Amino acid sequence: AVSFIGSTENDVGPSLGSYSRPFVYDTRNKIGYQNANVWHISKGFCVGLDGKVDLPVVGSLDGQSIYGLTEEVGLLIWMGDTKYSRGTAMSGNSWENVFSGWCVGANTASTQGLSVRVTPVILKRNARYSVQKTSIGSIRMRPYNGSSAGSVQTTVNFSLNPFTLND
Ligand SMILES: CO[C@@H]1O[C@H](CO)[C@H](O)[C@H](O[C@@H]2O[C@H](CO)[C@@H](O)[C@H](O)[C@H]2NC(C)=O)[C@H]1O
């Protein structure tokens, strides 16, 4: 089986968080969302994840997209499985495989989770830059091996909480 146990709408990062020192801010996992338990799965269900970023691509760094928020501020974005180190660097605006997948035991149960992580980028200087709450994109479960979603909700959404960068 599969069922949806997570939340449809999800905020990334603490609201009105402040961060200090294209220039990339070292924010680690602070501007993140993580949930180990988004779908409940059982009895041989096989599932991975696709991610999609809806923000405009305004540049590229080391093979991943810089996504634009404002004239001064962009984002590097990762989506993936639960643990932050599993994140896949996002490029472009299409669905992208961000977790190859796994299969829960034929006789047992577990969950499928996810993580979204971003790091702010100064694209252009004015030295205090604020960003408002902004839709980022979505992640969808991707069944495989003949597993079926039925009509279970496949997709969850992410919004960037507002933040301020101090330079
Ligand atoms: C037998 O326990 C299960 O072990 C597998 C690895 O064999 C896996 O770690 C399972 O945990 C889930 O793993 C998912 C895919 O990595 C992940 O998306 C979920 O968050 C994990 N669910 C948890 C940690 O409760 C584990 O149940």
Author numbering: 1 to 21, 29 to 133, 136 to 176
Paper text:
F17 and F18 fimbriae are wire-like structures expressed on the surface of enterotoxigenic and septicemic Escherichia coli (ETEC) strains that secrete toxins causing diarrhea in infantile livestock. F17, F18 and type-1 fimbriae are assembled by the chaperone/usher biogenesis pathway and comprise a few thousand copies of a major pilin (F17A, FedA and FimA respectively), several minor pilin proteins and a single two-domain adhesin (TDA) at the tip (F17G, FedF and FimH, respectively). The N-terminal domain of TDAs is a lectin domain, also called receptor-binding domain, because it mediates adherence of fimbriated bacteria to glycoconjugate receptors on host epithelial linings. Amino acid sequence and crystal structure analyses of the lectin domains of F17G, FedF and FimH elucidate a previously unacknowledged basis for strain-dependent glycan binding profiles of E. coli fimbrial adhesins, one that is driven by electrostatic interactions.
Surface Plasmon Resonance (SPR) interaction studies using a newly synthesized GlcNAcβ1-xGal series (x being 2, 3, 4 or 6) and F17G crystal structures in complex with these disaccharides provide insight in the structural basis of the variant-specific binding profiles. In each of these complexes, a terminal, non-reducing GlcNAc occupies the primary binding pocket in the same orientation as observed in the initial F17aG structure with GlcNAc. F17aG is indeed highly positively charged, with three more lysines and one more arginine than F17bG. Near the non-reducing end of the disaccharide, Arg93 (purple) is bridging the GlcNAc residue and the sulfate ion S4, whereas variable residue Asn90 (cyan) of F17bG, substituted for Lys90 in F17aG, is bridging the O4 hydroxyl of the reducing galactose and the sulfate ion S4. The majority of the amino acid variations involve arginine or lysine, which consistently lead to either an introduction or a removal of a positive charge.
